[PDB]
Each structure stands twice: as structure tokens, then as C-alpha cells.
Write a protein that binds this ligand. Sequence first.
Ligand SMILES: Cc1ncc(C[n+]2csc(CCOP(=O)(O)OP(=O)(O)O)c2C)c(N)n1
Ligand SMILES: Cc1ncc(C[n+]2csc(CCOP(=O)(O)OP(=O)(O)O)c2C)c(N)n1
Ligand SMILES: Cc1ncc(C[n+]2csc(CCOP(=O)(O)OP(=O)(O)O)c2C)c(N)n1
Ligand SMILES: [Mg+2]
Ligand SMILES: [Mg+2]
Ligand SMILES: [Mg+2]
Lengths: 545, 542, 542
Amino acid sequence: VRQWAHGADLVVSQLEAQGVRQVFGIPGAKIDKVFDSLLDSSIRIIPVRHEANAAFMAAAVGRITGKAGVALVTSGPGCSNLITGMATANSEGDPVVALGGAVKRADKAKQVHQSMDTVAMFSPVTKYAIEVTAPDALAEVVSNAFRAAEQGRPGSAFVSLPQDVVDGPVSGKVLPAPQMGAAPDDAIDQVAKLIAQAKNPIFLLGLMASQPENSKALRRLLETSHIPVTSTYQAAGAVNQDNFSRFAGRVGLFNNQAGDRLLQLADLVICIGYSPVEYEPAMWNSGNATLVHIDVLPAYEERNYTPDVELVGDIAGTLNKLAQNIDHRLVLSPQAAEILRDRQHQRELLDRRGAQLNQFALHPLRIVRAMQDIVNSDVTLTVDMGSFHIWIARYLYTFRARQVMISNGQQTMGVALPWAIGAWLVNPERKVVSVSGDGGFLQSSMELETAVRLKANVLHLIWVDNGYNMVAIQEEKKYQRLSGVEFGPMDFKAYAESFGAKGFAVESAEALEPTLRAAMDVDGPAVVAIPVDYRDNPLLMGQLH
Amino acid sequence: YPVRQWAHGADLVVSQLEAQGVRQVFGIPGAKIDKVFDSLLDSSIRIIPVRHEANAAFMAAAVGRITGKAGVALVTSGPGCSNLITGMATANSEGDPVVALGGAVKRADKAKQSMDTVAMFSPVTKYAIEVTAPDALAEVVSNAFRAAEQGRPGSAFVSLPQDVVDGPVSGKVLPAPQMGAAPDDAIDQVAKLIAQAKNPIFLLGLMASQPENSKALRRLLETSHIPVTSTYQAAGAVNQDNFSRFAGRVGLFNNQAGDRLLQLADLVICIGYSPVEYEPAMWNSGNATLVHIDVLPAYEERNYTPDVELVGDIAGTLNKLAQNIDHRLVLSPQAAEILRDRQHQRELLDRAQLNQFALHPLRIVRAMQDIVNSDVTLTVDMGSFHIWIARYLYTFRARQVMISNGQQTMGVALPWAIGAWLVNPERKVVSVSGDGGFLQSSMELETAVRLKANVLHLIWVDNGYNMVAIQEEKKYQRLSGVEFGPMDFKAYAESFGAKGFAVESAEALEPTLRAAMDVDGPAVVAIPVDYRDNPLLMGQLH
Amino acid sequence: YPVRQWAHGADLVVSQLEAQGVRQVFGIPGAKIDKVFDSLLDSSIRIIPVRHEANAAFMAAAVGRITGKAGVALVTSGPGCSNLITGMATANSEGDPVVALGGAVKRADKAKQSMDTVAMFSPVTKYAIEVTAPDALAEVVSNAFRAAEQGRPGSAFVSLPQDVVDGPVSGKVLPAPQMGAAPDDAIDQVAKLIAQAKNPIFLLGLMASQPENSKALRRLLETSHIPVTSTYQAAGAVNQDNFSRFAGRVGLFNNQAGDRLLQLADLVICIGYSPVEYEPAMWNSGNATLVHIDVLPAYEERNYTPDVELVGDIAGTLNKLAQNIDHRLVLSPQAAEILRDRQHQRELLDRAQLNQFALHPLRIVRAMQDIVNSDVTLTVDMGSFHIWIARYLYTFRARQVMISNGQQTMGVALPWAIGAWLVNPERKVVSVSGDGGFLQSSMELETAVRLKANVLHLIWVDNGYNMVAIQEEKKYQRLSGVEFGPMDFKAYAESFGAKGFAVESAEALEPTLRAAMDVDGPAVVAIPVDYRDNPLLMGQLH
Ligand SMILES: Cc1ncc(C[n+]2csc(CCOP(=O)(O)OP(=O)(O)O)c2C)c(N)n1
Ligand SMILES: Cc1ncc(C[n+]2csc(CCOP(=O)(O)OP(=O)(O)O)c2C)c(N)n1
Ligand SMILES: Cc1ncc(C[n+]2csc(CCOP(=O)(O)OP(=O)(O)O)c2C)c(N)n1
Ligand SMILES: [Mg+2]
Ligand SMILES: [Mg+2]
Ligand SMILES: [Mg+2]
């Protein structure tokens, strides 16, 4: 152990030990010693314009690297401004460690309830929430926060750091930054035998199946077996139409997915890193099939989810072993092949690569096609929440992006831009495309200054309707009249340029592709406003569950 | 197990309990939860009414600790639930799987001008939920058992709103884990470290004392002959007789061979151990290769940051580790000396004619060891007597001992004993406590008599709270609030219909214990004790 | 009271208690909180060790209810605190001012691998705080008493970390409200409504039973002669003898004159009343002018939305209201009939030779009324006997009765009685309970004997949980978990050193009660009861 002048120095040293490359946040009196200590480290300080976005950026870093993104904020409002961010990350399973300042331990303002009980506030939306009361257990708590966020089913962790603890001296050491084995060999063999006997098997991918550490094993198992696959949105990016011929689409939103039909037909369903909370089991489990559960944790038994076999342990190890016990590729049953044949037909019908679509404001389909043109395998795509989100999800089979951040169970708006910046920081050599509506854009657009400051190569697309359309179409369907969903117009090109970023505003369908192309080629942050005609939304909504 | 339409959610609950292998339920009925007690009447599940809910949690814990399956407590709303709190916290601390089903007001009256029980139980449980979705009643219960029984066992609380249990519901009962050993690659990495170790030592924790790990543990020890020491949560895992290289229990006394071996160690392998069981600072000097083996990743601490972590099925890991141990260990000079000292230490601790009255603690311990045989379960309450018994655990040869008690909750012994007896009603159980601990749960004597439980409860009588008195004496040289009046425990026990005895002389001690042990049913023996020599034992504590 | 340097925070605490007028403290010592018990030794404050912490909260509540000043409980960390929960919740529900001082681990070990007691107590208290600022120790305590004693009294919890009470602190003891009557203008507005009322009625709540409001209440009733009815929290505020227009207690029975008058009312004036005391839906038809008088604004409900609210000092308001009442009330035809019916009702309820054995409830009530005189405090536990006693409260003439119990917590009687006796040790106290309630707190008999408390505890013996059994019978026509074994309560009581009695025939009832009452000290009488006629009484409940 060492004698540390400040607890902040030990915290920073622990962060370095955790492999943290940067920290997102906003400084304040209570937490400033930590920002100060970061000056003497290898960790880059990234100042944001609103704490909420610090949590969103950290979440993106977590989902991509698999290692926790870090947010650093001051006490009081500093911490409360992160709450929505922490809840969103926790919901989508993104590892995030938030370090929040607090008044000194003995501050009498605590007894008079003059200072926020942040631990109580964060406990409901985090996997781990705690306040350091013992200076000597500083590295310990920070270390445990990372383990709690990155292990098991990933989530967010909050650590409250009293000012006196980080400012005062401490004596401790840096704790170096798991070793869980695959499922039992007998159970794996058991499953390999169920597979060899199944006529209509199918894989249902969940959150844990999309983790980076399981990518290789998953790819190997799919290639060896050639068994159909369907995914929940928390695994939307694990597999796509283009990289697997037997992909059946993502389930949980549209009522005609091949994944749902195959699951109904299945005589053997193998869930990977799946939890019933990702998609209602009653929606696909007919009970007429043998059920296998593969994950880092036991299954949450439920009326429509009582696994016949449960393989708990290291997912990658379990999938690799299973792959080694497969003698041949699956020969699709006439029925299964028919269902895949139908998805092929529906994609054909959803497509329109030859239609004019030159109306203005732009038709959602014309915008989706233009987005597909610029989003390729070297481009990451982040998607906000709103009506355009449903359009993009319907066509996820057409996006050939390196990766896509779209899952958003809490339906939190404003995540796209912050997600893109975080995704960009993980791979600054690649391009990132973020997309939102005007509502979401204005909730985090302040981070545009952050983007310009970082020279972040992010292209943000704004679908403009001058209102909260996703809520409006719900009100129209229920009351046939609108309330609180309409607002005024804005000059987004000028809005963007006022930050020093490149701004564009589509004034006709013909200008769409050229504009997106020029915006993509811009070396640095750019924003493109796209007026949209949401009149056809009812047609798309008719495909929802 | 098909999806059915149930006349009362209470019926689904009961079927779910039967599916979990529940044989009995402990508790006290009330208006809000009465439909469940009524449903149990058509069940194969036995209803065991207690006299105080706290004891339902204690009895359920013993059941859980012994069977591996959650003990079940059932109480009504309000005070029925709040009376379980201490019991639930005690089970959670000792890792005993318990599921408490607590009644509550109908959902609609919750915000009406009822206790927020979930909020009160959340701090002392692993799982605390309230059923708000009638159609997910079987799920919440089922998953409560999962929470209590899996990983590091603990207590689970489920609030059942009256309208949910009395009203009809649809649903199916859910059937009552398959994890493998640690990564073989890592098991070799550890096996290699063992071959390079000069002073290897095993530190056993809670999970190491689980029956599912028995065979593999013994197999690993018989093949390596590496010395062993245990926390009190694994007090029963290994004893002096079956392992000559046993180094005792660590955490209480400052002169244990286990601690000396830990300090001397170059390689320490912890199994089913968690810091909470014994302050790492107390034994981890910091310059030894630390290996962690458990069902859960290590809960890192300042002085407990393992170099290697083997997470997974313990029995599987240990079995694989054993197969990778070529030669048995040859104790180093210091190691051998340390173990030799423990032997000399035992000879000393054992070595006179203590015929004074009130009885000398050593005399009582000696007599206790005589009646406690390998077929008997011994339960120990909290108090000064606890220290005396702990000091001599090496010479106790009981089927099992329930002594671990981190919260230091008094009153646990009798209810634990009743719970343990119900698991194996053909055997005898012996519980011991002080007068203070005795009156906190003695109301269960009626329950013991009602059940015809073959339990013998011993009471060390000093007429006070001695364990507290000695700490006050040491710190203030005067006493406060630790002295109370005397009682005739013989008549007290007889009033319940149990057999009572009161030792009135030293020579009467042994004969009285025998007459009590020979009683087929509940019996209590009050034993006046002279705690004057406690200072000499306390000097042996950390 | 100057700012001093204290050797131990524990010393400041004690001085603060003395400043609050605390005469005794109830509790059980422990390592974390022992310095406080030690500090009390140099205090004028008496240390009263209990046998179970829950009872410390019950005894403290009686003290608070009677003196108006918070009763004090002192316990150690962990189970010491969790054992107080039910007691604290019961006090908070009945409005009894109680301050619990609970020990805790040193501040630095809190987040270390200790119970989050504040979080557990917050749901059942008015004030739950933990001292994190050593220099504000006297403040947190002082303000805990303020929280318990002011507004609507309730319980308050204070967690004292061991390092804070053992370590030195600086600070001064803080001296131990001045609110005026409601706005005179509004008092007239109400006085006007009273002059226009044809069927005015007073509904008394908790605050109306406070001694500080006695004189003003009587003065207001003697001047207006307006009929009165009371919730059970104000059961003692007024009785049949002192007010011929008393309409009984409302909330339990479906045939009360009070409810009929409330329904008939055109003007209802509630004093110190809060909906929680009696469901407004049960009596507020909704077409009467509703006036609310209390120390706190009305806690609006669906059927309790007062037209006029007089917030402020109750005694002052009532005194001013009285001075604005010219003529006494002339009962309307219906009002007079209703009161006449209550008179005929009493004549009936009173009207035979019940010499059966086991004893008939009516016989027991009759005998109870004979021994309970105007100098005796009567405490009543929860169970079927409770209903029987409530039915006949009009014929009980005790100094005071502790019966209100919204949580329906069993075991309250004896500890309450001990607490009430300590307030007036020269008087006799009588507590009554069922066998179930008796065993939950009977351990305090040792405390009673130790104190030489002049308490007589009566036990209605049925060998079960009857109040629950009758509800099961009605709903399921069968019983579950409500039957237990018999006991010899005579020997049980004697074992403690108290006087025990067991009624073995009807004719022996009265003589046995007398012999017990004549005992100068603790005495217990077990009374076998035949609950067969309970269905006839239950038909009288809402
Ligand atoms: C923070 C927050 N508040 C409210 C909502 C509810 N809601 C869901 S998406 C959305 C916004 C729709 O506006 P926009 O982002 O402009 O997208 P559009 O549907 O209009 O394309 C709203 C208001 C939300 N998701 N997040
Ligand atoms: C519920 C509870 N309250 C307070 C304590 C603190 N304390 C620890 S052991 C004990 C009791 C000692 O009395 P007894 O059981 O008579 O044993 P002795 O040490 O006197 O033999 C007390 C008061 C506790 N453990 N549990
Ligand atoms: C702590 C607690 N648990 C459960 C209840 C529910 N219930 C209400 S009164 C009562 C007991 C009745 O037993 P007893 O005291 O013997 O009275 P009886 O009605 O039989 O005369 C019970 C079990 C309660 N009030 N308090
Ligand atoms: Mg919009
Ligand atoms: Mg004792
Ligand atoms: Mg009874």
C-alpha cells in the first residue's frame, strides 16, 4: 500500500487500473479534486454540457468495449441530472460507473436533509449504489462498482464520494482489474443430442448474446449449425439479414416476424443470453417445444418460460463446446424454409429501390433509403426515440452498419447524439451516424459544442415534423385529437452552424442523397435537417404488435 | 403442470410450495393471510403455529440450512411482518435460505390512510417483493425460492395483498442451477501454484460447509493433506478427528494455529469464503498468493483481492483440482511446529476438579460434551457461554452445530433446535443459551411440547447479560443495565408441560443432564454459573 | 446551558435526556451502545433493563401517552434495533410519543461488509435520523423529542454510531410550541353554525383526549350540552356518567347511537380527529356541515372534506367557542329517541346467572368491572376478549384505559401496564390479554417482579387464537393454525416470583381476582373461557 495525498489520486489510479481511457462529466466544488487528479493521468477529461449526456456517452462506451464507461459529476444537481442516464443504461444492460461528489461525511446539512440522499435516489435505477464512508476502502468500492457494472447482466453503478474523502489523505493500494467456466459438459452433451434430433430448431438471442466477448463463439455456432436465428432488440446488432441467410428478424415490435412463426413451429428452442423481460414469453412460447436456456445466470421461471435444460456459465465457452458437438448443418424442414421464403417476400414488398418517392416534405421510406446509402460496415449508427425509430426498426434488415445502438426499453429520447459521440471516441477513425426527431435532438443538442470541440466525426440526422409525432399518432388513435404534441419550426442549419459544425437543410427530395453524401464526407461534426411527411405512419403502425 | 383457473390465489401459492418440496410452514395466522392457512388444510404441507413470528424465521432457517431448501414462514399483515424482521436479518447473515410469505392490505388500500413492508425488509434480505400482478403470483413465489436457495443463500420476503390471495387467479405451478466447474485452464494454473507452495493452507467459508461439496472437499483434502482452517460459518465442515492437519476455527481467538498458518502462507486457497465471514485484515498479511474459489466472483476488499478466481460449481472445481495433485504435502518446519503447538494447546486447555457451585464454565462444557453425541444436533445461542463453547469446539463431536451468528442475535438456539428436530424427528437436539437469550424465545416451549419435539434446552444462569457486563467492566470498571432478577426455571419449564430441572450442586450436574436427555420430548435444565473466571478466557479473544 | 467539551458524546446525550424531563430509560445494553448505559449511572435517570426490546417501545409508549413527554427506549445495534420495529410502529399508530435511541457501528464501517436501520424505521416513525455530525448530537436528539411530542404525537428513531457516543464532542444541552387558538373570525363562523344546527354532534379524536384539552373540552360540553361520540383513540375523553348525552365509541359496533347521530347530523364538529381513527365513509353521509378542529390542517379524504377548518391550539379554540354559545341544545325528536335507545340498549346488554365453566365472557367482564376502580389504569391487549371489553366500556370506570390498537398488535397489555405503573407507582394497574398475546411479552414479568410493579395481569384462556378462529369459521367453516396446547399459568407466574392463580370454577373467579388485587406486587390470573357465544357478539360488528 501507499500513502496517498488525496483519495482522488487513489480513485484516479484505480480508474487507470480499470483501463478507463476517458471520463465524461461536469466539475463542481465537491468533486473538483478528482478532475484535478485526472490532469496527472493518462485518462482524458471530456467535459460535457449536460450531465445526462455524460451517462449516455458512458453507456455507449460500455456497450461497445464491454468495459464500463465512466461519468464524473459534482454533488446535488450534479448527481440528480444523471438519473435518467443511469436508468437508461441499466435498462439496456450497458456497463456504466458514475462517480458523484457529495458534501463531507460530517456535514450537518445531511441531518437537516439539506443535501440529496443520492444513494436512495439511484438505488431504484442502478445495479449498485453506495456511498464511501470509509476512506481506506476507496479503491475497494470503486473496484466493486466496476465489477457490479461489467459482470453478470451488465448495468449501471453509482458511487457517492464525500468531499472530505476525496480531498483528504488515505492509505491503500490499487486493486488490479471473471474466470467462470462453461456449462457442465454433461448438460452440453445433452443439448447437442437434442439438436441432432430436432427437425425445427431455432436460436433466440437476447442481451448477453450481443456482448463482444461472445461474438466469435456465436458466429462459430451459427456457421457450424446453420440453425435459424431471431433476436430481441437488446441483441438487434448481434446478427442481421445480410450476415446470416437464416436470420428471421428481431422480435418484440412487429406482428408478422418470421422469428415468431419459427418459434411457434419449433420443437426445440435455444435461448442465448435471454431474459423473459426482453420479450414477453407468451408472445412466442407455445410450450410444444423443448426449451434450453443458455446464459451467465439461471432463468427467471415464468408461466411461459420454464426451461427444460439450463446451461449456466461462460456463454462463449458453452457455445464453443456446443459447436464442437455438432456433426452437420441443419437441413431446413419444408415448413421452416417456407417461413423464410415468406420473410424474403415481405422484405421484397417493404423495399422500393426503384420508386421515385420525390414528394416534399420527404416520405419516411425515401429517408430510410437515403440512410441506407451512407450507412455501411465501417459506420456505427445510433437511433433516438420517436416515430422515425419505428421506421428504422422495420428496416433494420437493410442497414449494413458495423454496429447499431437502437435498443431503448425506457424509450428515452435524446440518446442518439450522445451515444454517437461515445461510439466515436471508442473508434475515432470510424464514422458515426446519429438520427433523431426534433424533439429528441433539442434535449441533448447542447452536446453539439462538445462534438465540435472534439472534432468528433459524427453526422446527426434530424427528422423534422415540428412536433412529438410518436405521441401524436397514439393520441390520434385513441382520441382522434391532439394535445401537447405540436411546437414551432426552427432553422436547424443555422442552429448547427452557430456551434461551428456543418449544417444542412433538405429543401426537396432530389437534394436528399447529395446532401447526406456531402455531410458524410465532411471531416468533423455535421447536422442535416430533413422535413418529413408522417401521414403514412398509420400504415406502418398497422404492423405493430 | 397446466395453466389453471384458481378459485383463490391462495390455492396457487400452496401448490407452488408443494412444488418446492416444502413440508411444513411456520407462522401465526391473521385476517389478511388466513386464506393461505386455510388452503394448507387441503395440502400435504403441515401447519406449524408458533407463539411469536420471529421464531418462525429462526425455525425456517434451521430447516433451510439443513435441507438446502428454503424454510417457510407465513405471517399476517402489520405486526405479523414487522415481528419477522430480526429473524430474516439473522438468516440472511448466516446464509440460511428462508422465504417469508407476509400478508398485506388489499392493493387499493395501500396508499390509503398499512406498512411499507417491502421497504422494511429490503435492507435485511436478498429478495423483497410485493405481488401487484395477480397473474404472476406463482412466479414471484418461485423466484423467491430461487433467490433464497441459489448463489449465496439468504432470506426472501414476499408481501401478499389480501385481495390477491382471496381472489381468483389464472396460472400454473412452476417446477422447482446447472453450472459447471471453473475453467479447466484455471484449475491447472492453481494446481501448478500448489506444487510450488511451501506453506499452502485452505481457508473454508460458508459454501464449503454445504453437503453438496462434502465428498469433493474430503477427496481434495485426503489427496493433498494440505492444512485447513475454517470460519465459524464453516465450523462444521471439518473437525480435528477427521483431519489431523486441521488448524481450528478463525475469527474469535487470538491464538489459533489457523491464523499462524495463514500468516506463514505463501499460497492461500479460500473455498466458499466471503470477507464478511472473517475480516481479511485480520489474516491477510498481503504477501501470499491468494486463490478464490466460490459460486460467485470475489467481493473484493482492501486486503482480499485474490490473484486467481475460480467461479463456478464448487464440487466440480474441487474434484478437478484433486485430480491434479500428484504428491501429498510435506509440512515445512514452521508449519509442523504450529500444528504441534495446537496439539500442546489442546492438552493444556483440557487439563481439573472444578466442583465449585455455582458451576464453573469448564465443568459445564465438559458435561455438555458428554451428552452431545454424533447423532445429536447442537444449537448455540449468543452470550458469554458462546465463547466458552467455541473455545472447545475441537472436543465437541455432534452431528452438527448451529453456532455461527454474525448479528449476535440472542434467542436463536431453541427455535433453531425445534427447526432442526423437525427435519430429523427421530434424532435428539440440544440447544443452549443464557437466561437473557432464553426469555426472548422461550414461548416456543409450548410449540415444542405441542410437537413432542425431542429437544433439550440448557440454560447457563447468571441472572444477567454477562457478555455485555464483561465488556463494560473492562471499559468502565462498573456495570449498567446488565443485572436482573432470578427465576425458578424448573417450574417455568413444567408449566408448559415440559420436564424441568434446576441444578443445585456440582455433583447434581451430570445426573440431571442424563435424566433430561432420557426424556422423550421437551426438557429444560437451568444451570447456575460462576462467570468470575471469564476475564481469563477473554484475554484469548482478538 | 453553556457550550462544553464532552469526554464522550454519550455524556451529552444523557444531559439532553435530563433536560427533556426523562425519568427512566427502557432497553437492553450492547457493545455499541454501552457507553450510554454507563453514562446514565451518573444520571438521575433510572435504567430499566427489559427482557425484549419490543417491550421497551411499549412501556415507553405508555409513559408518553400519560405524561405527554416522550417515553425513551435505548437499544444496541443490529437485532437490538430491529427488535424495536413493531413497538415503534404501534406507538406511531396510536399517537404515543416515543424516542428510541439505537446503537450502530462506527460511521466508517457503515458501507463496510450493519443494518440500514434508518431505512427500516422510516416507514413506521415520524422521525428517523442517524447522527453523522458529532457536533450536532444534542440537536438531533432534541429535535427527535420535538417530533415525537408535537403536532400529532408519534415515534422517533435516532441511530447513534458507536464512535460518536464513545468519542468526545463539543456542544450544549438544548432546553426543552406557543401556538394560539384558531382565528377568532372563524370561531364565530362556527358558533353561528351551531346556533343554526338542529342536530349538532361532536366527534372526538385523539387530540381531544389530551389532558391539556380536558378543562376546555368539559367547559365546551357543559355550556352547549351538544351530544358526543368518540373514536377509540379518544375512548377515555368522555364517558356515560359525566355526560348524559354521550353516544358511545364509534368504529367497532354497528348499533351505536353515535353513528345514528352522525347520520342524522346537519352539523358535525370533529375535534382532534383524523380519518385514520374511523373511516369517514362509515359515518359521513355527505350532506352535513363538517367542521374540523385540530392542531394540524385536515388530512382530506373522499368523505372527509371539511367545510370549515379551525387549526391551532385546541384548548384555546374550544374555550373561545364555548364563550360564543348562548343557549344549550334542545334535542330534536330523532336525537332524543336515539339517546333513549342507547339507554334501553345498555339495560339490555346488562341483563343473568352465568355460572358455567369454562367461564362465559360476560361473567368475566362483569367481574373485571368490579375490580377495576377509578384509581386503576386498565390496559387491554388484542384478541376476542378485546371485543367483549369494548362492548361494555360504558360500564367500566377506570382511571384510564389503554385499548386503542389500530395495528392490532398482540402483547401490548402487560408492557403498557408496566409503563403506566412507573408513571404512578402508588396506584394499581390491570392488564388483560388472551393466551396468545400473553406469551409474546410475558418475559417482562421478571421486569415487573424486579421493579415490584403493582400490576395484575388477567389471561382469558381458550388455548388458541380465537379472534382469528372466528373469522376463519365464518369464512371457511373450518379452522387452521389457531389452536395450541394448554398451560399451567399459575406455576408460570410463580416461577418468576410473582403470584399466580388459575380459576378452576365459576364461583372461584371473583375471590381469585380479589386475592390477586390484594397482592402488593405482580400477580397473574389465568381464566378459562368458553368462546362459544362469540358469534352473537360478532353480529354486532361492522
Ligand atoms: C425524456 C422523455 N420524455 C417523454 C417521452 C415520450 N415520447 C416518446 S418519444 C417522444 C418524442 C417524439 O418527438 P421527436 O423526437 O421529435 O420524434 P417524432 O416522433 O416526432 O419523429 C416523446 C415525447 C420520452 N421518450 N422521453
Ligand atoms: C436481540 C438482542 N439484543 C441485544 C443483544 C446484545 N447482547 C449480546 S448477547 C446478550 C445477552 C447475554 O445474556 P445471556 O443470554 O443471559 O448470556 P450470558 O452472557 O449472560 O451467559 C446481549 C444482551 C443481542 N445479541 N440481541
Ligand atoms: C404480532 C401479531 N401477530 C398476529 C396478529 C393477528 N391476530 C390478532 S389478535 C391475535 C391473537 C389472538 O390470541 P389471544 O391473544 O390468545 O386472544 P383470543 O382472541 O384467543 O382471546 C392474532 C393471532 C397480531 N395481532 N399480532
Ligand atoms: Mg418530431
Ligand atoms: Mg446471562
Ligand atoms: Mg386465545
